[PDB]
């Protein structure tokens, strides 16, 4: 690989600062050597710097765990990949012909909820920020509507496909995520820093706030640090850090997390663009220079990650914003991948 370009990162993150992030910040374990860049505040009321070492909310990222768990569940033979999910959670979804890995890969067809739940960013936040949901309710929000494609068909990102998760991992094992993410990822990679401690709404440790923009243009900020996040669960409640999520992209992309047949199943990519793809809970982005990276992003309010790693996971790159809602910071915070993997141009 290009050696990492540093100073296009340090202008990444001024510019994401210049577009209404109060914070920014990136970290590369570039086979062994780290870069570690950071601009702003952690805390914009109290001036507390950002650092990588601040624990943050992965949103999305949290579909990777989920789907972690879920294919070493396969590989136990608990599970398999081409069942309908009705076969393991009986009358849950109105068609049968829906399986697993439509799910995995929002090929299902289910109505994504959230779009009924932020309409509206700042008022939907303040609805949901300090309700728990059960799975079966985000569910039944979610088959108010009706599917928006045939099963299989068509790609749609759907968080309700990452609640169909956490209740099959639930079901098939008979504990919560929670422990199963700690048995099988958190402690085994020595995830110092990761946690899922749904319904409790404190980030445990020294963290970055959460900023969430609101939709009118110009307005002020909304602290949406503490939430219990009971809306997305499985699908994006994990707390993480830079180094940790690093760790995480590396040892799956490495081989340790399951085995080589259910990681090549992972990595069977839908087209999502001209340049990305999404596999089994895991997204594929085309850089530039002709690299592509493997690990996903996340949105949850307040916070903005992008957490990738190359094919072989030598190298990893965890970036963070802690703001949402901005579209500019988002699509400047992909450029840390540029900066991270082509290098200078
Ligand atoms: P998570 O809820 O963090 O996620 C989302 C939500 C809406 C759009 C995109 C994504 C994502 O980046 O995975």
């Not at 099959?168 to 401690?197: C, M, W």
Request: charged share 15%; aromatic share 8%.
């Amino acid at each position: 690989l290009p050696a990492p370009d540093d100073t296009g990162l340090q202008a990444v993150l001024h510019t994401a600062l210049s577009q209404g992030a109060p914070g920014a910040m990136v970290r590369v374990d570039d086979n062994g050597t780290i870069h570690q860049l950071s601009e702003g505040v952690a805390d914009r009321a109290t001036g507390r710097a950002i650092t990588t070492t601040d624990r943050f909310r992965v949103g999305s990222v949290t579909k990777s765990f989920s789907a972690v768990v879920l294919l070493q569940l396969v590989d136990e033979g608990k599970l398999d990949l081409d069942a309908s999910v009705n076969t393991y959670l009986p009358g849950l979804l109105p068609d049968d012909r829906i399986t697993v890995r439509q799910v995995m890969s929002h090929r299902s067809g289910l109505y994504d909820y959230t779009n009924d739940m932020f309409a509206q960013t700042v008022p939907g936040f303040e609805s949901v920020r300090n309700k728990v949901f059960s799975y079966q309710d985000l569910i039944t929000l979610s088959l108010k509507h009706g599917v928006t494609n045939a099963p299989g068909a068509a790609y749609s990102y759907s968080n309700t496909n990452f609640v169909v998760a956490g209740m099959l991992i639930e079901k098939l094992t008979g504990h919560s995520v929670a422990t199963e993410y700690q048995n099988r990822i958190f402690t085994p990679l020595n995830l110092t820093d990761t946690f899922y401690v749904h319904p409790d709404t404190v980030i445990p440790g020294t963290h970055a706030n959460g900023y969430l923009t609101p939709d009118e243009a110009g307005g002020a900020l909304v602290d949406s640090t503490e939430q219990t996040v009971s809306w997305a669960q499985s699908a994006g409640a994990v707390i993480s850090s830079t180094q940790d999520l690093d760790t995480f992209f590396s040892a799956l992309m490495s081989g340790q997390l399951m085995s080589a047949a259910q990681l090549a199943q992972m990595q069977q990519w839908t087209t999502v663009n001209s340049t990305q793809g999404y596999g089994l809970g895991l997204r594929r982005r085309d850089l530039s220079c002709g690299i592509s990276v493997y690990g996903h992003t996340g949105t949850v309010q307040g916070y903005y990650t992008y957490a990738f790693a190359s094919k072989d996971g030598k190298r990893s790159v965890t970036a963070l914003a802690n703001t949402s809602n901005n579209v500019n910071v988002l699509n400047t915070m992909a450029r840390t991948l540029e900066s991270a993997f082509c290098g200078k141009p």
